[PDB]
Write a protein that binds this DNA or RNA. Structure first.
Lengths: 173, 151, 260, 118
RNA sequence: ACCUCGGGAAAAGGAGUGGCUCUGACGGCCCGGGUCAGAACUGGAACGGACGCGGGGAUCCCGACUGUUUACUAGAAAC
RNA sequence: CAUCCGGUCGAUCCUGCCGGAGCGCGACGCUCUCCCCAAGGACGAAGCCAUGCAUGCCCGCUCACCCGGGACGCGGCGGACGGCUCAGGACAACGGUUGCACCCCCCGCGGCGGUCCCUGCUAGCCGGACACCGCUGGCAACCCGGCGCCAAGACGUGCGCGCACGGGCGCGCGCCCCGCGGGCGAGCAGCGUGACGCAGCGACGGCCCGCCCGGGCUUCCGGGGCAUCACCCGGUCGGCGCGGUCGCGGCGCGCCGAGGGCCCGACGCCUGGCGGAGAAUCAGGGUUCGACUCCGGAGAGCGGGCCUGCGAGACGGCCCGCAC
RNA sequence: CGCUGCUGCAGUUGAAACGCCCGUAGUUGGCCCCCCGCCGCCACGAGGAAACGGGAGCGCUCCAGGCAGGCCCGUUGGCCC
């Protein structure tokens, strides 16, 4: 019964708009997916990453992710891409309450294990700052994929002014 | 600017471009608008972001391109364009001047004061009331009278 | 609401179909296929009304079930199969084959053709699009889809389909001077040379074409179908889209009714 | 619809009990009856079980579809390769290659058409 | 409701409230305040957990009111 | 397809209403020789319903005591169309006009066709298994239990062409602008390359791809009465970041601002309010109605909620409360 | 019923000029430039439903009708709205 029609909403003036129809299955919206992480592998290993699949109007299926673990992350200015497990979620624009639960949302800044990206550090002088993150086992990456709309969490390693901005916000914690 | 709780970047411009030199240094994406309109210099030279701005953002101009005066610039990067028009009644062959208000997105590239003529161009439903986006502005004087104009 | 409509009311049905108001409370519901309802006419209507070969819908189904008629060379059993411009309706058992074109008054007309003419049918490319790994495809008015077209062909350029090998034969490109036949609206059913094409950037390219009566008709690119270069190419109806006016048709009607 | 629970209780009308083991005992029902199942295998693997194209290798009854003239009754075999069937699949596999072959040929021509123009 | 427009009014009539674990606000020039929000999570269905601390409404009669009054039987509508 | 005439007076001329004169379209009375066409429980009860009836067809897959009848089931396709009514709803539906560079779609038609692996492939063709059915039963009725055999263009699995390729991801034009095209008015597609993923059909090679037809929203302009309704709104109005959706959007949620609407009548309220195409009457101008034939909308006693499917918030589907 | 009045009502006395002045919204504005740009504006298009209403033709025996008919404009069923 969750619906995205504007029949139940007011006008520009703020006038009540009379309802002329009952709910439509063409206007329905499904409940939101909380894409948690398998962060605590100790007691979360008992549930492998699970991606559900929901039928949609047209019969086309949208895979929706319930629990995720790893996604393709790419260092663009180095052309180094590897599948990396997501260690932790930090700093979301929508709410920092989400960050506590680790629920993944497109645009959340995550931390990924640098062990897959180890070869790039040995390759000489790739960028500068990102190399230090590879030397320490945590690299910041933004999830660029919508978990729950494709059931995947791929992303990009943060670089440039964006990396600095995110780090500055996360400096005290 | 820590208070900005989210980094705002043009989607097309890879963040890495700001480093290195000039090989693929386009640091700005400016798209030609069609229907014979010219790109403002402030979209090319601008340092603003704005997804809704037609020239430097992910919005398309298609459909009716009406023109109207600016009722007010009070909203955040938006204007309520007032467009005047005449409605004819046949029984009394006299007409009735009728006015409508339409919300429009104002690009930072443009700067409008109330009363200015703005050529709004139709765009994707961008908000509850915004389905039009300013495509060009021509300035008007401080005080020249309200003047009914149905251009 | 809910899904699709599988019924057509008689007065809703297109005027050109010329169905009787008191003839029925329902009209054939035209099916989907190569032509749309506004730009089609059901196979049952050609056989029941103009041909009169089958007295009732039931007889038309019996004939179709036995594959008596073949359109485009293929025997089709659809009573409601959509039929439109340049479709070759050939009934071999009766020994008579004709094309389906447009009359000056806009009703679809059966125009007799020779065996060479029967073989090929003209087509109009709506546009060329990239799909399935990037191969180009051209979509004809008859919805026939042709992969890998020759590069010169553009949007709105008439081409000719072999219909035996079903491939492109030749291209008569749309340009100033080339003879065209209007397919829709007030000037539907008129063959004229193109005087000019108005670009009208933004929407509705509007073209002006004039027949040999010195009268120019102004019609947008949507219903302009090229029929050969300066030559009319494929055989055209006897009136030849010359635009008979109402007063002139009044005299013609009176001569016909003079005969008893 | 109202259903009843798996636990059995003092009130009851019908209980259905399969037998894991009767025991050495002899019961007039279940030890004095051996069931001759009416139906017989109608598939390729099932025909190759009881009797080890094997269409003729089936027992035959004389019953009509609806129930002096008697039709010898054979239940139709299924999943058995006919010689035309094997052939039918064989030409579709060849047809699939032909579709690839024609597309393979059309592809070189189209690459060439752009190349010859430039 | 009513009103001398000040009141009535804390009207009536409700909802929340604990502990822990956090996250924002707010100054000065890395240094201070401990108040105000917003969350989770937890508890026999609990939290102003003692204590402190209006029952409420509708009227009628007198006296406008705050005042004062028979020490020691009237605190009033009396003065 | 332009008209008047009786009634204020002792008389008279006015203004002014009153009443007649015409046509409808419903009722009511009286009466009716035939034939043709033709409305018919809409009118403040969208009150309640007894009965019978309105949705089937197929023959894919026959070991049902005629035959190759084509029971029954299983499968398949339709039941979402159509019919019915006007309760709801007054910047709405609806009508013309746009858009989707913000989309979804069965059939049909015309195309296109390749599907990594390691294992596990049987590919001359693979597993099991469910009714129908046989028996054993429980039912007041409804309704179903258990046991055993057996089939599919049903099901489960998989043969398969590392330019094998569903989704999503990262990257890959500019130099003031605009002047070829795969394709536009519009930087849009497509793909090249890396990381992911291994989805679909592949057991009588269809996935996909257009067009259509339908849908969803979208622009513009029109879209009641009341001032004894003058101020109104507070997700209200914008911006951002997400989620959700077929998608776009306060649509929802955070976050941040303070908008937004209004004598060119906002907001409220009422409507014995479906709207148009149209209809009645009619010099010209006009007035009133539009349930009802076509089109779009909305609802099946009332609120809700769902499943199936390509499409239903379906009621001759389900589930719940509520009356009956 | 020109008793709703845009055509097209009436306000000295029949009903009816606010007691007066200022006054914003609203509505209304003298004369002037020929030769361009927008606005209305007029004409003619195009585009999209028929039925209906007109309206061509046709003797349903007339008629309300209907698209007919008859060796026939590729018989018709035009066209306007």
């Amino acid at each position: 019964g969750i619906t995205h029609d504007k029949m139940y909403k007011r006008s520009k003036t703020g006038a009540v708009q009379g309802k002329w129809h009952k709910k439509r299955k063409y206007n329905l919206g499904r409940q939101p997916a909380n894409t948690k992480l398998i962060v605590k592998v100790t007691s979360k290993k008992n549930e492998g990453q699970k991606i559900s699949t929901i039928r949609c109007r047209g019969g086309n299926i949208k895979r929706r992710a319930l629990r995720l673990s790893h996604g393709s992350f790419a260092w663009g200015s180095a052309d180094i891409s590897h599948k990396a497990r997501i260690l932790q979620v930090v700093y979301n624009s929508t709410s920092n309450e989400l960050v506590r639960t680790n629920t993944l949302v497109k645009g959340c800044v995550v931390q990924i294990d640098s062990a897959p990206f180890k070869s790039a550090l040995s390759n000489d002088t790739l960028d500068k700052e990102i190399l230090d993150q590879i030397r320490g086992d945590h690299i910041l990456a933004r999830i660029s994929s919508r978990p729950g709309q494709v059931g995947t969490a791929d992303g990009y390693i943060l670089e440039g002014p964006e990396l600095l901005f995110y780090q500055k916000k996360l400096a005290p914690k | 600017n820590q208070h900005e709780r989210a980094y705002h970047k043009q989607s097309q411009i890879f963040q890495g471009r700001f480093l290195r030199k000039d090989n693929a240094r386009c640091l700005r994406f400016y798209k030609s608008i069609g229907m014979g309109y010219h790109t403002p210099i402030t979209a090319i030279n601008g340092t603003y972001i704005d997804k809704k701005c037609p020239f430097t953002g992910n919005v398309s101009i298609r459909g009716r391109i009406l023109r109207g005066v600016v009722h007010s610039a009070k909203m955040q990067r938006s204007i309520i364009v007032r467009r005047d028009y005449l409605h004819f009644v046949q029984k009394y062959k006299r007409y009735e001047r009728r006015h409508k208000h339409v919300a429009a997105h104002l690009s930072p590239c443009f700067r409008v004061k109330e009363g200015d003529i703005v050529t709004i161009g139709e765009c994707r439903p961008l908000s509850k009331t915004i389905r039009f986006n300013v495509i060009k502005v021509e300035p008007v004087s401080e005080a020249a009278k309200k003047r009914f104009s149905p251009f | 609401a809910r899904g699709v409509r599988k019924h057509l009311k008689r007065l809703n049905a297109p005027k050109h179909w010329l169905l009787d108001k008191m003839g029925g409370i329902w009209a054939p519901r035209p099916t989907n296929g190569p032509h749309g309802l506004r730009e089609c006419i059901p196979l049952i209507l050609i056989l029941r009304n103009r041909l009169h070969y089958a007295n009732t819908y039931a007889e038309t189904s019996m004939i179709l079930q036995d594959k008596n008629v073949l359109i485009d060379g293929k025997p089709r059993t659809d009573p409601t199969f959509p039929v439109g411009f340049m479709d070759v309706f050939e009934i071999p058992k009766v020994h008579k084959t004709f094309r389906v074109l447009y009359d000056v008054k806009g009703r679809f007309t059966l125009v007799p053709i020779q065996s060479n003419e029967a073989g090929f049918k003209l087509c109009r490319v709506q546009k060329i699009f990239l799909g399935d790994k990037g191969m180009p495809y051209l979509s004809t008015h008859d919805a026939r889809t042709i992969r890998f077209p020759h590069p010169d062909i553009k949007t709105n350029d008439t081409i000719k389909i072999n219909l035996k090998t079903g491939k492109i034969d030749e291209w008569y490109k749309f340009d100033i001077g080339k003879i065209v036949m209007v397919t829709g609206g007030r000037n539907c059913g008129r063959i004229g040379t193109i005087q000019a094409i108005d670009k009208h950037m933004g929407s509705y390219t509007m073209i002006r074409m004039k027949d040999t009566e010195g009268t120019e008709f102004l019609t947008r690119l949507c219903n302009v179908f090229v029929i050969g270069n300066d030559s009319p190419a494929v055989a055209i109806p006897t009136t030849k889209g010359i635009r008979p006016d109402i007063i002139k048709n009044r005299e013609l009607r009176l001569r016909s009714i003079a005969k008893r | 619809k109202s259903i009843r629970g798996c636990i059995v209780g003092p009130d009851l009308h019908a209980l259905s009990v399969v037998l894991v083991d009767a025991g050495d005992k002899t019961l007039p029902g279940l030890t004095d009856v051996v069931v001759p199942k009416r139906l017989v295998p109608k598939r390729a693997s099932k025909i190759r079980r009881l009797f080890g194209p094997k269409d003729q290798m089936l027992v035959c009854e004389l019953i009509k579809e609806l129930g002096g003239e008697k039709k010898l009754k054979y239940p139709k075999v299924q999943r058995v390769v006919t010689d035309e069937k094997y052939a039918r699949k064989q030409r579709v596999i060849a047809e699939k290659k032909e579709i690839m072959r024609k597309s393979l040929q059309q592809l070189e021509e189209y690459k060439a058409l752009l190349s010859r123009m430039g």
